[PDB]
Amino acid sequence: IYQYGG
Amino acid sequence: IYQYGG
Amino acid sequence: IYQYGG
Amino acid sequence: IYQYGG
Amino acid sequence: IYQYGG
Amino acid sequence: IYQYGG
Amino acid sequence: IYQYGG
Amino acid sequence: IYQYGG
Amino acid sequence: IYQYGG
Amino acid sequence: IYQYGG
Amino acid sequence: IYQYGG
Amino acid sequence: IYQYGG
Amino acid sequence: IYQYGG
Amino acid sequence: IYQYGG
Amino acid sequence: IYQYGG
Amino acid sequence: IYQYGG
Amino acid sequence: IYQYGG
Amino acid sequence: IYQYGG
């Protein structure tokens, strides 16, 4: 699981 | 799962 | 699952 | 599953 | 499944 | 399934 | 299934 | 199935 | 799990 | 220009 | 320009 | 320019 | 420019 | 420029 | 510039 | 510039 | 500049 | 500059 926000 | 937002 | 938003 | 929005 | 919107 | 919108 | 709209 | 609209 | 915000 | 092959 | 191969 | 291969 | 391979 | 390979 | 490989 | 490999 | 490898 | 390896 890889999550990137911004 | 790969999630990218922005 | 690959998700890209922006 | 590949999803791209933007 | 490949989905592209934009 | 391949879907392209835009 | 291939769908293209736009 | 191939569908193209636009 | 990898999460990046900012 | 729209090109589809396959 | 839209190109789809495969 | 939109290119999809595969 | 949008390129997708695979 | 958006590039996705894999 | 957005590049994803893998 | 956003680069992801792996 | 954002770089992720692995 | 953000770099992540591993």
Author numbering:
A (entry chain B), B (entry chain B), C (entry chain B), D (entry chain B), E (entry chain B), F (entry chain B), ...: 1 to 6
Text from the published report:
However, while 45LNIYQY50 (R1), 47IYQYGG52 (R1), and 137VTQVGF142 (R5) formed unbranched and elongated amyloid-like fibrils, the 129TASNSS134 (R4-R5 loop) segment formed scarce and more amorphous structures. The 45LNIYQY50 (R1), 47IYQYGG52 (R1), and 137VTQVGF142 (R5) segments bound the amyloid indicator dye ThT and demonstrated dose-dependent amyloid fibrillation curves with short lag times. 45LNIYQY50 and 47IYQYGG52, which are overlapping segments from the R1 repeat, adopted very similar structures. Both segments, as well as 137VTQVGF142 (R5), adopted a classical amyloid steric zipper architecture, with two possible dry interfaces between paired β-sheets. The β-strands were oriented parallel to each other along the β-sheets. These three structures are class 1 steric zippers, as defined by Sawaya and Eisenberg according to the organization of the β-strands and β-sheets. In each of these dry interfaces, the chemical properties governing fibril stability, i.e., buried surface area and shape complementarity between sheets, resembled those of eukaryotic steric zipper structures. Specifically, the R1 45LNIYQY50 and 47IYQYGG52 segments and the R5 137VTQVGF142 segment formed fibrils that bound the amyloid indicator dye ThT and formed canonical amyloid class 1 steric zippers. The R1 segment 47IYQYGG52 and the control segment 129TASNSS134 showed a milder effect on the fibrillation rate of Aβ1–40.
CsgA, a 151-residue protein, consists of five imperfect sequence repeats (R1-R5), defined by regularly spaced serine (Ser), glutamine (Gln) and asparagine (Asn) residues.
